[PDB]
């Protein structure tokens, strides 16, 4: 006979001891542990709500891969990827390039807690965490791998993060700040609680739903599976915040959450927003990116924050108005600058799509439509060269993303500049500039693409130069997803 888990579980996490041959601080340096003066005994109250043991893990995860990998081998020769809507293919190429290696990196973020967390329970759960991201990283390499003979772009599922392409920098900017350069307790909150519990756990759910609607059951299977692993490690932030509030650290906690949520939002506004409101076919759109955030992300954050004893970030109101604009500009930028990315941006501004946009976002044509009007005319009038850039856009020094906002009949584009130690920084939002100010030492000497350009680090100092700089060459340089097909509806 075997025992019930509830009878011996506690013993797996009864691993703290009092060092004697080295001091506690040497064993757990604050810069890596972040105990913040909370005693070892107090961190021992840490109690993950979702428990699991090694044997259960290997058994469960063994069958998950068995399924995911079987699905793939079964639809392999069917070559669906060829009949797939270009808007979709671009979606995957973008996803794999920006996430594959970042997933693998997360493995290390987990490893940080696994070694430096004073909370024993946190340490073991993090070991499964590092195992979860090992899989996510490997499985998301194996899958897109099947398409490397279809386009050099798929090779970016592995190469992206190793390049200086602006979106890649933007990715590393976020991730490094949230999980690679933060102490253990910080990682549990910024990554696990804010990004995984707050964004990806439900994003991947919606992503899996969309994959299915597009007829892409291989990707749909991939995301669903990966998604089922999220809760197991995304749970690690909860208990940490409880401990910090339970003591004299409610403000420190609050500030990490505030930073993490906003930085997440931004990355989300360029990687997900553009995709569900422009790359997905009109007849497959269940709800807008805004409705998605109000229903599956925002409400949950307030709940999480309420039950935890924390408050809504100071920027909460602005953040919700932003749901009407940010991603629209972030989309216009990516498309208008297609040669600077490794996937083909779908314009998604057909007459029908435009009225859908107006329904979901009242006043769209009045503003965003304005720019698209000028762009459409030029494509119809045989002046496409006026739909591609001659300069670089202004990059936010925090989210390393373009500084854009409301245009048209309600022009409202702003720059939250700041002068710190003789240097002038640019910020795409109040929050972005604030994340810099609360901890200037952390971003002070970093430089975005535009800064590097202005310093002669990019040679030749022209557009062709910046392209070789961000490792882009004809073949992977992005263009219109449907080859400007949608333009015929205006001729």
């Amino acid at each position: 006979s075997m025992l019930k888990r509830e009878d011996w579980y506690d013993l797996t996490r009864t691993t703290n001891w009092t060092p004697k041959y080295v001091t506690e601080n040497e064993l757990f340096p604050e810069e890596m542990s972040g105990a913040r003066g909370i005693s070892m005994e107090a961190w021992e109250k840490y109690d993950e709500p979702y428990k699991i043991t090694y044997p259960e893990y290997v058994s469960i995860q063994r069958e998950k891969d068995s399924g995911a990998y079987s699905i793939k081998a079964a639809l392999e020769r069917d070559g669906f990827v060829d009949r797939a809507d270009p808007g979709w293919v671009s979606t995957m190429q973008l996803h794999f390039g920006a996430i594959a290696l970042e997933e693998y990196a997360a493995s290390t973020a987990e490893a940080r807690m696994a070694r430096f967390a004073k909370a024993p329970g946190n340490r073991n759960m993090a070991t499964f965490g590092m195992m979860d991201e090992n899989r996510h990283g490997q499985i998301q390499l194996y899958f897109p791998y099947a398409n490397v003979k279809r386009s050099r772009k798929w090779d970016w599922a592995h190469k992206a993060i190793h390049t200086n392409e602006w979106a890649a920098i933007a990715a590393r900017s976020f991730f490094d700040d949230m999980m690679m350069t933060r102490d253990s307790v910080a990682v549990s909150i910024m990554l696990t609680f804010a990004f995984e519990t707050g964004f990806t756990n439900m994003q991947f759910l919606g992503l899996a739903a969309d994959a299915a609607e597009a007829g892409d059951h291989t990707f749909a299977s991939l995301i669903s599976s990966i998604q089922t692993d999220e809760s197991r490690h995304a749970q690690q932030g909860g208990p940490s915040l409880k401990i910090l509030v339970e003591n004299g650290k409610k403000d420190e906690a609050q500030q990490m959450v505030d930073v993490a949520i906003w930085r997440s939002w931004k990355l989300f506004s360029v990687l997900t927003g553009p995709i569900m409101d422009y790359y997905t076919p009109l007849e497959s759109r269940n709800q807008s990116f805004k409705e998605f955030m109000l229903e599956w992300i925002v409400a949950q954050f307030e709940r999480q924050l309420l039950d935890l004893g924390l408050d809504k970030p100071w920027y909460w109101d602005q953040f919700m108005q932003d749901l009407d604009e940010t991603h629209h500009g972030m989309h216009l930028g990516v498309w208008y600058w297609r040669p600077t990315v490794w996937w083909d941006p779908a314009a998604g501004v057909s007459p029908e799509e435009r009225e859908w946009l107006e329904e979901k976002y009242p006043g769209w044509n009045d503003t965003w439509g304005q720019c698209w009007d000028v762009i459409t005319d030029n494509l119809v009038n045989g002046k496409p060269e006026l739909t591609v850039p001659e300069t670089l856009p202004t990059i936010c020094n925090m989210c390393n993303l373009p500084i854009a906002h409301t245009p048209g009949n309600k022009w409202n584009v702003k720059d939250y500049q700041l002068e710190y130690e003789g240097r002038l920084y640019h910020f795409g939002s109040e929050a972005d500039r604030w994340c810099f100010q609360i901890d200037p030492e952390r971003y002070k000497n970093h430089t975005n693409l535009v800064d590097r350009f202005l310093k002669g680090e990019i040679q030749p100092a022209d557009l062709a130069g910046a392209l070789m700089y961000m490792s882009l060459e004809p073949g992977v340089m992005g263009d219109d997803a449907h080859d400007y097909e949608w333009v015929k509806a205006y001729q």
């Binding site: 629209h328 216009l332 202004t394 022009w411 584009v413 002038l424 640019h426």
Partner: protein
């Protein structure tokens, strides 16, 4: 010589890097900015004139005035508005 500034063209959705000359006129600056906005994703306005104002404090620069006399921090953000 060249001087960098960030162009926040009116009615456009984004700020763009736009190199000017320290000798350029606020008028000539606006022309170099329009290049990257007008006819690209912002309609022209003949009945109107393009003016230049420092984005931070809203200061309006005379149509004349050369970059050199505006006292701008390199990479400074400037509004390019439609008026008379």
């Amino acid at each position: 010589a060249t001087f960098p500034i960030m162009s926040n063209f009116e009615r456009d959705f984004v700020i763009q890097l736009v190199p000017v000359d320290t000798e350029d006129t606020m008028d000539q600056v606006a022309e170099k900015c329009a290049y990257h906005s007008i006819n690209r994703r912002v309609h022209p306005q003949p009945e109107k004139i393009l003016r230049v104002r420092r984005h931070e404090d809203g200061t309006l620069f005379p149509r004349g005035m050369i970059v050199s006399d505006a006292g701008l921090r390199p990479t400074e953000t400037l509004d390019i508005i439609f008026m008379d």
